[PDB]
Design a protein around this ligand. Structure first.
Ligand code: HEM
Length: 446
């Protein structure tokens, strides 16, 4: 019953283009905006069906999403069923132990009405599409802010700015995806509003959409690299190899993608590259106490925080299916320049770079907001551990600018604690609703 022809492609497939632009806009003269929304945008919005087929990847892939104030600007006063969306991300900031005082000023408010996501293999093609939009909409659309993003170059293609292969793990949608070994399998309504087993009643025109949580997350890459070298556990290999082990313990995967739960002391690049094997784990190991054993993967490791698997019950053998309702689909892409020679040499960031983080979910409170607040920022999550104080997620965990206490990272002693400065700095973002395609030229243009 999942009508993928009507679902925007970034939600379930991803744009998978070299370059992306996030174009954050305001609406003036809504009657004019609406005419062009229907005539100029709706026909070129890329669907899941379109992106699922090579023969039909468009030259420029385009998606569009609206904030609460953007829907209101279009005269849409309906309750979409999500209080977090309605209130906007700025009002949610304190839930994550940050302040909007640190944000890009355009995000610290509700002036942004929407985002157009443009993706293409060159920036020139994106620019041409933006020029076309500005030409036909005229002054009815106004750019408030934008952020350019790119797949990283060379041997870092598909890796985020710290160097780790990204985009490996996603929930499988039951009835749509063919699940990979170890992959969680969830009802479509966890991700798509109004789809199977979404318990929240939605406006009819909104069935087939998703909520988009956007975060501009700066990464302090030279600082991270230097921290790992300075805190590398003693051992037989090179200093860099031991630093790499510590980084892998923090993320829960080696940079190659190999999950540490399956290879806890050394990388396995072949495993990392193999989608049939690189997700096939639950954190359980026969003969080890799940509640205390951190020898395979720390309880505080990023991926263990964000998908706890057996830490939240369910099958000890793959696939673990726990906490399906707390799943998110991720379509983030790195932004900013590569690390420059001088920054690396000084172990100091000068230019801003990071992750243009994008999460899709049908309930913000169950997805992004939950994972940040209840897990990453919670020293006592996952529950039931010994010792009980897991500490914060070393990658994304926040405590109002203070160093984060993170336990279990050191293989030699699970009781050893590290106090870690932030390596990821929030510059804010917004919550949007990516409508079904039918609503774009339909209700939203009416
Ligand atoms: C700059 C910030 C971030 C970086 C560098 C980062 C990096 C990574 C990496 C390297 C992985 C493992 C690769 C993969 O499984 O695809 C991962 C997985 C994941 N991340 Fe993060 N991430 C960031 C922000 C976030 C945030 C803010 C959240 C949610 C609040 C989040 C949620 C997840 C989830 C759900 C997974 C998959 C877990 C699983 O299914 O096993 N990430 N991330």
């Amino acid at each position: 019953s999942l009508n993928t022809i009507d679902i925007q492609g970034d939600i379930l497939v991803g744009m998978h283009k070299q370059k992306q632009l996030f174009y954050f806009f305001a609406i003036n003269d809504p009657a004019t905006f609406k005419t062009h929304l229907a005539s100029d945008i709706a026909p070129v919005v890329a669907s899941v069906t379109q992106l699922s087929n090579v023969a039909t990847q468009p030259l420029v892939a385009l998606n569009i999403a609206f904030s609460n104030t953007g829907l209101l600007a279009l005269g849409v006063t309906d309750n979409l069923g999500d209080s977090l969306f309605a209130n906007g991300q700025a009002k949610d900031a304190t839930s994550f132990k940050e302040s909007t005082s640190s944000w890009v000023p355009q995000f610290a408010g509700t002036g942004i009405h929407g985002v157009i996501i443009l993706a293409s293999d060159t920036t020139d093609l994106i620019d041409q599409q933006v020029a076309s939009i500005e030409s036909t909409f005229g002054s009815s659309i106004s750019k408030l802010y934008s952020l350019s993003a790119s797949i990283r170059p060379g041997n870092e293609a598909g890796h985020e700015m710290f160097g780790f292969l990204d985009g490996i793990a996603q929930p499988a949608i039951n009835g749509f995806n063919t699940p990979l070994p170890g992959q969680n399998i969830v009802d479509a309504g966890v991700i798509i509003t109004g789809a199977t087993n979404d318990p929240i009643t939605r406006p009819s025109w909104a069935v087939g959409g998703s909520f988009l949580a956007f975060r501009q997350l700066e990464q302090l890459v030279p600082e991270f690299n230097k921290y790992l070298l300075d805190n590398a556990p003693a051992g037989s290999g090179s200093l860099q190899a031991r630093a790499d082990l510590l980084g892998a313990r923090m993320v829960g995967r080696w940079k190659s993608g190999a999950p540490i739960d399956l290879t806890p002391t050394a990388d396995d690049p072949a495993l990392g590259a193999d989608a049939q094997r690189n997700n096939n784990f639950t954190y359980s190991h026969a003969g080890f106490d799940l509640g205390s054993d951190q020898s395979h993967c720390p309880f505080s490791a990023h991926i263990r925080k964000t998908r706890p698997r057996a830490d939240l019950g369910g099958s000890l053998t793959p696939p673990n299916l726990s906490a399906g309702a707390n799943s998110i689909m991720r379509s983030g892409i790195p932004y900013g320049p590569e690390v420059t020679s001088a920054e690396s040499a000084s172990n100091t960031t000068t230019q801003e770079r990071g992750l243009a983080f994008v999460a899709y979910q049908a309930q913000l409170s169950q997805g992004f907001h939950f994972l940040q607040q209840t897990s990453a920022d919670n020293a006592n999550f996952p529950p039931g551990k010994t010792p009980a104080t897991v500490g914060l997620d070393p990658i994304i965990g926040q405590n109002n600018g203070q160093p984060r206490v993170v336990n279990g990272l050191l293989p030699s002693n699970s009781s050893a604690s590290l106090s870690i400065p932030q390596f990821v700095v929030s510059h804010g973002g917004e919550y949007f609703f990516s409508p079904p395609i039918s609503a774009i030229g339909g209700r939203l243009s009416a």
